[PDB]
Amino acid sequence: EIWNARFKVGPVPIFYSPYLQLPVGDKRRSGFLIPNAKYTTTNYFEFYLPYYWNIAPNMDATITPHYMHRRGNIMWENEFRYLSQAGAGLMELDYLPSDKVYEDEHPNDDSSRRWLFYWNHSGVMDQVWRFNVDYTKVSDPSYFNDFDNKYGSSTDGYATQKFSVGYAVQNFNATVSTKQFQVFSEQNTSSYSAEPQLDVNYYQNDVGPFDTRIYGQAVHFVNTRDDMPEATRVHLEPTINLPLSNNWGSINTEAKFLATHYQQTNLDWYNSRNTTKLDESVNRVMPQFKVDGKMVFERDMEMLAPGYTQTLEPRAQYLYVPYRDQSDIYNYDSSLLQSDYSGLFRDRTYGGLDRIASANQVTTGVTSRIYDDAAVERFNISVGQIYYFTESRTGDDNDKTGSLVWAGDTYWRISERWGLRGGIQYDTRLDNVATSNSSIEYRRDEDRLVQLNYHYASPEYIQATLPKYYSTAEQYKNGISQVGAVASRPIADRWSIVGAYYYDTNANKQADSMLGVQYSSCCYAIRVGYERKLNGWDNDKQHAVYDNAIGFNIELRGLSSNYGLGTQEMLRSNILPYQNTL
Amino acid sequence: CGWHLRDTTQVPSTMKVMILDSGDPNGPLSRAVRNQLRLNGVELLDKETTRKDVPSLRLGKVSIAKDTASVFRNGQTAEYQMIMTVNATVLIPGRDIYPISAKVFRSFFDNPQMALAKDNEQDMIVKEMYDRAAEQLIRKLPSIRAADIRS
Amino acid sequence: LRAPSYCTSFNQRAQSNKTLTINTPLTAGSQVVVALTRPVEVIEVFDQTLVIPDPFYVTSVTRNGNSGITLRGDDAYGAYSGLPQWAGVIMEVLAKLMTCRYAKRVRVNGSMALPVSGVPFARWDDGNVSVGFDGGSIIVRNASYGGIDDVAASVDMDLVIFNNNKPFVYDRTINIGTSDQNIGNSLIQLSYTGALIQNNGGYNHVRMNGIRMAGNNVRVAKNRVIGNYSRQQFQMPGKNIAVPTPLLVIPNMY
C-alpha cells in the first residue's frame, strides 16, 4: 500500500579502515573525489562533494559538504586520520548550521544546530600495553534517528564515551575501563554503566597433575536515572581441574569456588514500592563441582560405500552448584541464556554474575560421524538431553525435575555443491516441538545457487522466553513458521538475476519478496531492485502493514578490478539476507 | 556389531609436537586452540624454537557474521543467525602447506534486554563459538596426514 | 437533576493487584455515584532488567452493599501486575452536600494550579488543544502537534469547583470516546481520559489523554508527555486507551 523509490549514482564505495596503515605511495595525493548523488521519495535530493587532503605522510583529512534539500542547508562532514607514536585514531565532526525540519518537529528547542563528534583511538605501547578510546557526542536526542551517521556508536539511544587500558601477556591479563552515557532530559530509558570496571585473569598450568586459573573483577554500576539502585561488586573465582586423556576417551574433573561481595546504595525508591527489600551488604559464596567424560568408538562401514569409517561419541557431564538465596541482590547484568545442543553442556544459566542458579543435573549426548576414505567428515548427527535431580532455583525466579528438554543437530555434506543442515529442540512435559530449523542448498559458484529454508518456534516457547507483553500481542503470540527460497542465475556473461520469497504458513501471508537484476560492464554497473516486506502493524483492525521499495543504482567503477557480476551483494539487500550455509 | 575402541589417535603422531603461530598469541581464538590441543596430548612449542622438524599451525583471519533469520508478524527481527569462519594453514616441514577452515553456526532469539545483559550474552555466545571452531579445526588434522601420504 | 450528598473522598494506592476498596457507611436503596478524578496511572513495571511503562486504568466500580465500594482495573497489555493510585469522590443520591465554591472565566497558560481544592468542571471552545487534570493542576497542551515534545498551549475556560453558593446538581453522565459527542450548553468534568503509546521518532512515546471540546462536542485528544523510551532497547505495541468510566456533566447554571 506504501511505495518508495531510490536513485543513487556515484563511485564504487571503497573503504580504507579507520586506522592509518602507513603512507602507501603517498596515499592518493590531494584532490577532489568523484561526487555522489541520491534521490528518495522521503528525503528528496541529496548531494556529496568529497575532498581529500594529504596533510602529511602520517596525517590526512577528508571534507565532504553534504547538501540536503529537505533540511535546506549543507552539513559539513570532516574526517581526520592520524598516526603518532602512541597509536592511530580517527576524528569525525559533522555540523549542520541550521535544520528546517528540526524547527517544525521540535518547537521547544531554541536552536536548530545539529552536530556529532566522534573520536577513536588505539595504540600498543611496547608490545603489551593497549589503549582504546571510543568517544561520541550528539547535540540532541533525535540526531541518531534523523541522520545515518557514518561513524558513531549509540547504546540504548545514548552516545557512549568509553576508555580502556589493557595489559596482556601469555598468562596474565589486566584491563580497566570506564563507560558513560550522554543523557538528555527528554529520555527516560534505564541503562547501567560500569564506571569503572577492572578485569584480571591468570592462568598457570602443569601444577603437578592439575591446572590452575584465577579470575577477578571489580565494577561499579551507575544508572542513567536517579531512582535506580547503585552497587559495587567484587568477584573472585579460583579454578582447578585435573584433565585425563587417552587414545579413545577422556575425562575432566574441575572444582571451582565463587565469592562475590556487594555494596548496594540508593535503595529507597525500590524498597518502598517492593515487598522484598534489597540489603546494603551481600556476600555470596558458592562452590562448584563438575565432571565431564567422553568416549569414542569406530567402525569400518563396509556394507555401504567401502573404505568409510563410522564413529560413535557418547558424552556425559555432571554439574553441582549449591542453592543460595539471591533475592536481596538486584539484577544489574544477568539474562537467561537460550541453549542449543552444544549449550546443553554449559555450566551457566544466566549471562552475568548477579544470578547464579543452582544445579544438580546430568547431561548426556551421543554424536555419530561418517568419514570417507580421505578422512574427511561428511555426516554428523547429535542428540542430547539434561536430567534434573533438583529444580534449578535462583532465589527469586518466577514438575521441574527429570528429562525436560532434548536437542538435536545434523549436517550432511552430500557433495562439493550440495549441503543439508538441521536442528531441533523437542520439549517434554508438553509433547510438542519448541524450535526447529532446516536448510538445503545447492551452490556451484558465487553466482549460481538455490536454497530452501524453514524456521519454526512454538507459541509456548515464545511465551516462556520472550517478555510478558509478547504473549498477549497479536503480532508475537502466534510463534514462527516461515518457509523461504533463494535463487540466483547469471544469464549471459554481463547479467545477474536473483530472487527470494519468504512465506509465513501460520498466517498464510508472505513475509518478504525480492527481485533484482544487475547489468555489469567494464566501465559501469546498473542495478534495479524490488522488495515487498512487512513494515509494522495497524492497531485498528490488527493486520500487518506492507511496504514496497524500488531501487535504481548506477556505479562508476573505471578501475578494471575483478568487479563481479553483482551477486552476493544484491542477495544481502532484503530484511532476510542470504547466508552461505554450505 | 563391528564396533571397537578408536585405535587411531586424534592428532597423528607426526603432529604430536607442533608449533602454534598466530597474529595475536594472547587472543581468544589462540587461547581456545591452545586449550584444545593440550587436552589431546599435543606438546606446544615456542614460535622461535631451535627445532626445525615439527609441524607449524598458523592461525589466520577470523570472520563473524550476524544476520536476521526470521521475522515476526510486524517485520520485527525474531531470530539471528550467527556464522563464524576461521582459516588456518598447517605447514609440514619439508612438504607443502595444507589449508584448513572451520565454520560454526549459531541461531538464537532476539531477547530484548538491557545493554550490559545483552553484551554479556553476546560475549558468552562468541566464546562458545570460538571453542567450537577450535574443536572443528582439530578434527581436520587426520585429513591432512592422509593427504600428505598421497604426496 | 440529581442532588447527591457528599460521603467521602479518597486518594490512595490499591491494596491488592488492580483492586482498590473504599469502606464507608451506605444506606440501603441509594444510588451511589462515583466521580473519579484520577482514573489512570502509568506504572513502570520490571521485566528481567527492563523498566516498561504500563498504563493502569479503572474498569469497573462495584458496590459491596451498605459497606463501601470497590474499583477493579486493568493494564494496557494485561500481562503485568501492580498497585495503581486512584482518586475520586463518593456521593450518595439519598448529609453534607457539595457547593459551588469557585466560578470564574480564566486563561490557563499551559498549567494552572487549582485555586481551591475540589472537583473541577469546565467548558471551552478551542479545537486544537486538550485539557487534563493530574490531581492538583489543569494541564493544557497542543493536540495538533504530532511530535515527541511537550508543547503547551493556552485556552479560555469557565471553571467551576465543588467541594465540602449553590448545591452541586448533575443531570447526565457521558462515556467519552474517539467520536464527537454533543453535550449542549453544559460543563464537563476535568480529568485524564486514558493513555497513549505510539512509535514516534525512534522512541516509545508515551502520552496522557485529555478532553477536546470544539463547539459543543467532546472526544479524546492527546495530552502531556509521560516519557520517551528508545526503541533500540525494546519495542512496544501501540496502544490508545479511552477509559470506560463515565464523566459527569452539569448544566451551565453557575
Swiss-Prot record, chain A:
Contains two intramolecular disulfide bonds. The keyword Disulfide bond applies. GO terms for cellular component: cell outer membrane; transporter complex. It is found in: Cell outer membrane. GO terms for biological process: Gram-negative-bacterium-type cell outer membrane assembly; lipopolysaccharide transport. It comes from the Bacteria. Keywords: Cell outer membrane, Disulfide bond, Membrane, Signal. Its main location: membrane. Belongs to the LptD family. Together with LptE, is involved in the assembly of lipopolysaccharide (LPS) at the surface of the outer membrane. Component of the lipopolysaccharide transport and assembly complex. Interacts with LptE and LptA. This is LPS-assembly protein LptD. It comes from Shigella flexneri.
UniProtKB/Swiss-Prot annotation, chain B:
Belongs to the LptE lipoprotein family. A lipid is attached at residue 1 (S-diacylglycerol cysteine). The chain holds residues 19 to 169 of 193 of the full protein. It is found in: Cell outer membrane. The keyword Protein transport does not apply. This is LPS-assembly lipoprotein LptE. One of its GO terms (molecular function) is lipopolysaccharide binding. Component of the lipopolysaccharide transport and assembly complex. Interacts with LptD.
